[PDB]
Symmetry: C2
Subunit: 412 residues, 2 copies
């Protein structure tokens, strides 16, 4: 047997906001966080826009001196984590610190630091590389810094599964608690891949929208005029907690995490199979894990990246899994508003799935002006839809064909 | 309920060889894999040597057209993975492909490729960034490419926990099998951080030995004249398999994985605590997980990096965990010969621990000419020691205070 895992705290930086409630207000209003990227000469680039975090003040979290040691993606991960831990009300003590761990990940890690240190290396030579280049750039330093700052001695690790990172981080942290290796985990992901290297690297694969004239209309999941994903920055963290532990201290419980699925497509380095067979296996594994029938799902937060092949693969996968229930659930892509936060996508979208449960509302897929061929599900086009939601899924389908699904259920 | 996990296949690239038997021959003969680096000009660097993989032929594994797309860390991880799967005798079929996954990790991943593309970006422009920049560099793509080549549809992920990566990858993969999420996992790690940012960045932290004039003597764990770690490249992969699945197909079983521990130090971003308190918590977790009396431990493959603080912290931790039995077990650092493969260290060292069990021999700590203050355990100085080994423990410690321990034992 297995213990129950609940969500007691959430934290976020996104293109919509510097916290969860500001971000969520944007989501339910259909607001875009996408804009031309500033303080960068993007003249030579085919994409000049994305989802930046606006007005982030790291000195609310760290001293200037500690922040100078860390890449932006680590700053963002620590901000969401500190928010989530504050939101949980949890008191770390000598009696529980060995039972509290961290799994905060990233898909691409420290590109901004790699750029700035490459500048020094190329121009001046290796003796100008920062002493903090390695520890301030490696993906496990959100978990590392958070554990040092809060005195967490539980399991300490970091996943990196490209665009699936946040989903896998949360699911695997839930397993840690369910199987008794921890009582509390801080889990999620963070990403800062604006930089030239993110825009240039994805741009070279022609993976990005190039709708430079109308950045807010670029991310248009399942719309016939979509032309690839929009790159976005930020972070999501959840406090996952064993249910009896949460009840004993009088925690506020947002929702229960009942299911976690994983699969591999074993198909292609970057593209999904046309029928989303892997995504279907992963959703079926998550529902089996939750002991739920597909007919019990009310709301899906899609991966919904605005890539032609990805978006159609998900429709096929959902039709395959859900059969005569596929039209009754509501499925939306919040990436229509946030863009694609890569390894943090699954983290912020797990939060939006939990808030869909709290508020009984399916967030919109904005920009869905002309659904493409076969995109005839309830994709919540344009405007948020109040509805009954007992069970919400969140999907992430990333490079290497790596798939993750989380199942959340209302708690009372 | 929790299933038993055995080792049925192993694969490796190291500074001592292009497979496991050749590497292990070097280990038992006390041979150094460390030499001046030939693949780039290091005259401006304070460290000009390391553990390179010599004579690697990627066309033993993959077409030249595919290999040109992939950072060396991916090529090394695939080579070790392919060797491990072949060594296992396992046949992937429609009946089992959903139950076989992969967890191959890296500390830094494709830094060579990111550096080369950053040079293109800065000197020329984004138009010269490779289309394969992202899928040829990011850490999850060992697991990704391996799954595509062999048709593995089970859990597909990657850890990145700095120098603890290979140990965490193997332990977490064992938990997948133990808890019924998979029947077979390919798990381990790969690293190739020997580029200007890697050598420069560890150099700027003054973390590396600067013994340029005698590279084979540079790595000297617990020696009073040690002056930092030696940077090394390669990969380890193991096929982990549920016991009854291995028995059912008549697999050759090398050893059983009986224990896994993690802990965070919660001490410092890069320094280990002097008393080894986090390492001790991690080993005690692993020994309890294995249902063992600490006196059952015969052999410890130490982290043993040849840093002043790391090496003495490990003595303190072993004395704290094992008490008077600390004087009866044998503990060695194979990094004395291989150097520090960073995210691959725990993977190659897990393999060396399993071969210590197969061959009933403790590998030597070479270069241990003058053991430092308090370094008065059996550290198998200079020469391999034939001895009874029923239980072997492999330790890793990393940036962020992240600790892993694996416990292996002979299978009958
Ligand atoms: C054109 C050469 N090939 C196919 C063998 C490749 O580059 C290749 C194989 C996989 C997997 N991804 O890409």
């Amino acid at each position: 047997s297995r213990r129950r895992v609940v969500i007691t705290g959430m934290g976020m930086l996104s293109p919509l906001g510097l916290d969860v409630p500001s971000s969520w207000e944007g989501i339910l209003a259909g607001r875009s966080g996408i804009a031309p990227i500033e303080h960068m000469d993007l003249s030579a680039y085919s994409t000049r826009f994305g989802g930046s975090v606006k007005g982030f003040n790291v000195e609310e979290y760290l001293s200037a001196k500690e922040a100078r040691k860390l890449d932006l993606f680590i700053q963002y991960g620590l901000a969401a984590s500190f928010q989530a831990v504050r939101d949980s009300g949890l008191e770390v003590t000598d009696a529980n610190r060995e039972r509290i761990g961290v799994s905060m990940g990233s898909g691409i890690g420290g590109l901004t630091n790699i750029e700035n240190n490459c500048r020094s290396l190329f121009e001046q030579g290796p003796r100008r590389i920062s002493p903090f280049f390695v520890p301030g750039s490696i993906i496990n330093m959100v978990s590392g810094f958070l554990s040092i700052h809060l005195g967490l001695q539980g399991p300490n690790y970091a996943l990196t599964t490209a665009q699936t990172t946040g989903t896998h981080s949360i699911g695997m942290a839930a397993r840690n608690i369910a199987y008794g290796e921890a009582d509390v985990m801080v889990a999620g992901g963070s990403e800062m891949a604006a930089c030239g290297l993110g825009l240039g690297g994805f741009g070279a694969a022609r993976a990005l929208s190039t709708r430079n004239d109308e950045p807010t209309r670029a991310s248009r999941p399942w719309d016939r005029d979509r032309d690839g994903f929009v790159l976005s920055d930020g972070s999501g963290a959840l406090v996952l907690e064993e249910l009896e532990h949460a009840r004993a201290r009088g925690a506020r419980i947002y929702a229960e995490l009942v299911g976690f699925g994983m699969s591999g497509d074993a198909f292609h380095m970057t593209a999904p199979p046309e029928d989303g067979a892997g995504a279907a296996r992963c959703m079926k594994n998550a529902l089996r894990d939750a002991g739920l029938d597909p007919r019990q799902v009310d709301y899906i937060n899609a991966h919904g990246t605005s890539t032609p092949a990805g978006d159609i693969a998900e429709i096929a996968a959902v039709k395959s899994v859900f059969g005569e229930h596929a039209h009754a659930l509501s499925m939306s892509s919040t990436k229509s508003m946030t863009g694609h936060l890569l390894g943090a996508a699954g983290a912020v979208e797990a939060i939006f799935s939990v808030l869909a449960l709290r508020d009984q509302v399916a967030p919109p897929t904005i920009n869905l002006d002309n659904p493409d061929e076969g995109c005839d599900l309830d994709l919540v086009a344009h405007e948020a839809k109040p509805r009954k939601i007992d069970v919400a899924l969140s999907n992430s389908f990333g490079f290497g064909g790596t798939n993750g699904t989380l199942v959340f259920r209302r708690f009372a």
